[PDB]
């Protein structure tokens, strides 16, 4: 239970490097005990403290809009159970990180994401598995962020006004492809639950829904021409398929959820 | 030129901020940092980051030989704080022209003027005079003459005076905070190129600190500050990690510039220098037997994830200012346990340096065993484990370590990957290395290409 915030308790954040309340490994959840000491509550990083004109989340004194209901213009709803708004600020089940009331995650608690887990068991020049030990060899299209030193999977994290995989349509479709809209329709669901995002505070924390489109057949895979289209001409820098191993530039990110993918399909990871 | 490209982070220091505890001013009075915003500003009501901490092209951009303490010629720079770390790289590799760091050695500590065992002072300072001499790599020192940063130039005083060798001359760039330095003056020569001169004196302006007896360079970050210690970590985690992520230009395989850490003592701030760097990927060596930071982490680094809300080792410390457990008045004690336990959790970035046989565990190589462990966390089908490490143990005639570190791994046996560090064991002699590559069985007909023997016979004795 101490693995709530191992990325969120980082000191340097490249948006807003504020960290000045570490919370111990024996005292990670705020529900049992975090400390009696407290951090401040101000990051906001872009527009406003709690008004947030392009990201209409909620104010703090204009109280939260009853997390269970379908409140309006932004669903912060969860696959988690306790979305605890306590003092007008939504305290997480993962414990107070000691951070400062982040709205820079564009939701004040975006508690749903879905990464384009395109599951293709890789094969050799004529067809094989990981003879590494016994397991399978897995390859996944991940997309390199052009400025940051990591690759990335675009979260299906509910663009404001749009549904879930339409923030995965920040880049899934701009590489010009208006045809195939049946992504999770041929998909197999994997995991629901928390991911330790590094910008997670008590008042903001991110979790996932994971869906696999298993291309074990390896012949009618979705490609640049077959069944999909990704040019990487205007919004894609490096969109290469990547093989599973435990260093690849997905460091404190999406890689930390693909071990359940390797347990599902028998991949080497 | 690099006079104009480096700029300042300095501001009017008397105008506001009633921190009036200092007895020679109201609050850091004039004939000082009020040089441009000396007159009446618009409001100036806060000396916060609201108040812009201004810049100007640099003055402290020259040579200073010591008056009666040294003779060598060294360059020191006053810098900004939040500049990108790339322009100073052009200052240190083109304007200074210094040879590429083969390894970064970050020595951190506190203001606590400690003196360890002389046999510890032997095997430490006899260990450092060989590692940089065999490489020519860069060494991060820390400046000031109070603390660990007083003892580290004594090792440079073993190299600058006793084992004086410009062949393999060490690069110990200290990094000081402009504001905590003892002398503002002797630095404002408005020429951009001074061969100036002043005196090392720690009691000279003793409320502030002078610097160590021997370092190669001193980089002076300004904040507007005045004696407020503990500002190197926004530069130490950025400037050194920038020159970490510089790959080598060419040579065998173009690997990245590695970084190892060194801790001897230190307090909060030194503990907050090492734990974030391990999350940033910097392994470190920890001297069990001398340390405020560098002792209590070494006892527990082998122990698993447990907790004592630290209550026995919390006063197993150094000389015990605020003597005991009950009246230590340095709070956040349970909060300090996570700053040790994440170092305990990240297990590949640790090498404990004990007293008994860790000096007999070859201190010349025992510092680099951290990167033989930390870069072994790399597995991405991408060899940053298994060629970047393989250029390290070959430089120390450590075949027995190389037999233990990679040959006893889950080694992918990679005969093409032996081949560039085959040649590292061929450009110099390295007899059991080539035998181990034949004990592993380097196929010699397929290792030998034409451009192999072109490169080989280009590297004659």
UniProtKB/Swiss-Prot annotation, chain B:
Residues the entry annotates as binding ADP-D-ribose 1: 108, 113, 236, 267, 270
Tissues of expression: Highly expressed in brain and peripheral blood cells, such as neutrophils. Also detected in bone marrow, spleen, heart, liver and lung. Isoform 2 is found in neutrophil granulocytes.
Subcellular location: Cell membrane; Perikaryon; Cell projection; Cytoplasmic vesicle
Cytoplasmic topological domain: 1-461
Domain of life the protein comes from: Eukaryota
Family according to the record: Belongs to the transient receptor (TC 1.A.4) family. LTrpC subfamily. TRPM2 sub-subfamily.
Description of how the protein assembles with itself and partners: Homotetramer. Isoform 1 can interact with isoform 3. This interaction decreases Ca(2+) influx through isoform 1 and suppresses susceptibility to oxidative stress-induced cell death.
Notes on the domains: Contains two binding sites for ADP-ribose, one in the N-terminal part of the channel and the other in the C-terminal nudix hydrolase domain. Both sites seem to have a role in channel opening, but the interaction of ADP-ribose with the N-terminal site is absolutely required for channel activation.
Protein name: Transient receptor potential cation channel subfamily M member 2
Organism classification: Eukaryota, Metazoa, Chordata, Craniata, Vertebrata
Residues shown, of full length: 67 to 527 of 1503
């Amino acid at each position: 239970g101490d693995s709530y915030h191992v990325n969120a308790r980082h000191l340097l954040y490249p948006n807003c490097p504020v960290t000045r309340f570490p919370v111990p490994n024996e005292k990670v959840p705020w529900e049992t005990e975090f400390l009696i000491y407290d951090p401040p509550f101000y990051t906001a990083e872009r527009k406003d403290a709690a008004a947030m004109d392009p990201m209409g989340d909620t104010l703090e004194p204009l109280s939260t809009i009853q997390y269970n209901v379908v409140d309006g213009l932004r669903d912060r709803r969860s696959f988690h159970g306790p979305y605890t708004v306590q003092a007008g600020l939504p305290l997480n089940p993962m414990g107070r990180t000691g951070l400062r009331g982040r709205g820079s995650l564009s939701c004040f608690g975006p508690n749903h994401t879905l990464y384009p887990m395109v599951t293709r068991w890789r094969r050799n020049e004529d067809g094989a598995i990981c003879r590494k030990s016994i397991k399978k060899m897995l390859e996944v299209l991940v997309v390199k962020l052009p400025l940051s030193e990591h690759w990335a999977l675009p979260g299906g994290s509910r663009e404001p006004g749009e549904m879930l995989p339409r923030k995965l349509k920040r880049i899934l479709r701009q590489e010009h492809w208006p045809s195939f809209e049946n992504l999770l329709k041929c998909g197999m669901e994997v995991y629901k639950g928390y991911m330790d995002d590094p910008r997670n505070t008590d008042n903001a924390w991110i979790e996932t829904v994971a869906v696999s489109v298993h291309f074990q057949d390896q012949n009618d895979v979705e490609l640049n021409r077959l069944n999909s289209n990704l040019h990487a001409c205007d919004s894609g820098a490096s969109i290469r398929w990547q093989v599973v191993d435990r260093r690849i530039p997905l460091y404190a990110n999406h890689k930390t959820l693909l071990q359940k993918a390797a347990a599902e399909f028998g991949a080497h990871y | 030129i690099k006079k104009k490209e480096c700029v300042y982070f300095v501001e009017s220091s008397k105008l506001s901020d009633a921190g009036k505890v200092v007895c020679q001013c109201g609050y850091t009075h004039e004939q000082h940092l009020e040089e441009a915003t000396k007159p009446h500003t618009f409001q100036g009501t806060q000396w916060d980051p609201k108040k812009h901490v201004q810049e100007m092209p640099t003055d402290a951009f020259g040579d200073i030989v010591f008056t009666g303490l040294s003779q060598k010629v060294k360059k020191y720079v006053r810098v900004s704080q939040d500049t990108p770390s790339s322009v100073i790289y052009h200052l240190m590799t083109q304007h200074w022209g210094l040879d590429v760091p083969n390894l970064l050695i970050s020595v951190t500590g506190g203001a606590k003027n400690f003196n360890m065992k002389p046999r510890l002072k032997s095997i430490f300072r006899r260990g450092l005079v060989k590692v940089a001499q065999t490489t020519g790599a860069w060494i991060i020192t820390g400046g000031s003459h109070t603390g660990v940063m007083k003892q580290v130039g004594e090792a440079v005083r073993d190299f600058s005076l006793s084992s004086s060798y410009k062949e393999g001359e060490l690069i110990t760039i200290g990094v000081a905070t402009w504001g905590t330095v003892h002398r503002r003056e002797g630095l404002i020569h408005p020429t951009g190129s001074f061969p100036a001169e002043y005196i090392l004196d720690e009691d000279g302006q003793g409320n502030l600190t002078c610097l160590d007896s021997n370092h190669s360079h001193f980089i002076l970050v300004d904040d507007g500050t005045h004696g407020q210690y503990g500002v190197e970590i926004p530069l130490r985690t950025r400037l050194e990690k920038f020159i970490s992520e510089q790959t080598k230009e060419r040579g065998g395989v173009a690997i990245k510039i590695p970084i190892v850490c060194v801790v001897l003592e230190g307090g909060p701030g030194t503990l907050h220098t090492i734990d974030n760097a391990t999350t940033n990927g910097t392994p470190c060596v920890v001297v069990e037997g001398s340390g405020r930071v560098a002792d209590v982490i070494a006892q527990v680094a082998n122990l698993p994830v447990s907790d004592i809300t630290i209550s026995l080792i919390q006063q197993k410390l150094s000389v015990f200012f605020q003597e005991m457990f009950e009246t230590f008045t340095e709070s956040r004690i349970v909060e300090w346990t996570k700053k040790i336990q994440d170092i305990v959790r990240r297990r590949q970035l640790l090498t404990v340096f004990r007293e008994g046989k860790d000096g007999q565990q070859d201190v010349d190589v025992a510092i680099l065993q951290a990167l033989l462990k930390a870069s072994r966390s790399q597995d991405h089908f991408g060899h940053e484990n298994w060629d970047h490490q393989l250029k390290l143990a070959v430089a120390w005639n450590r075949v027995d370590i190389a037999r233990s570190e990679i040959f006893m791994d889950e080694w992918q046996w990679k005969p093409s990957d032996l081949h560039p560090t085959m040649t590292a064991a061929l450009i110099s002699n390295k007899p059991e290395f080539v035998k181990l590559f034949l004990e592993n069985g380097v196929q010699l007909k397929e290792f030998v290409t034409w451009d192999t023997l072109l490169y080989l016979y280009e590297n004659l004795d």
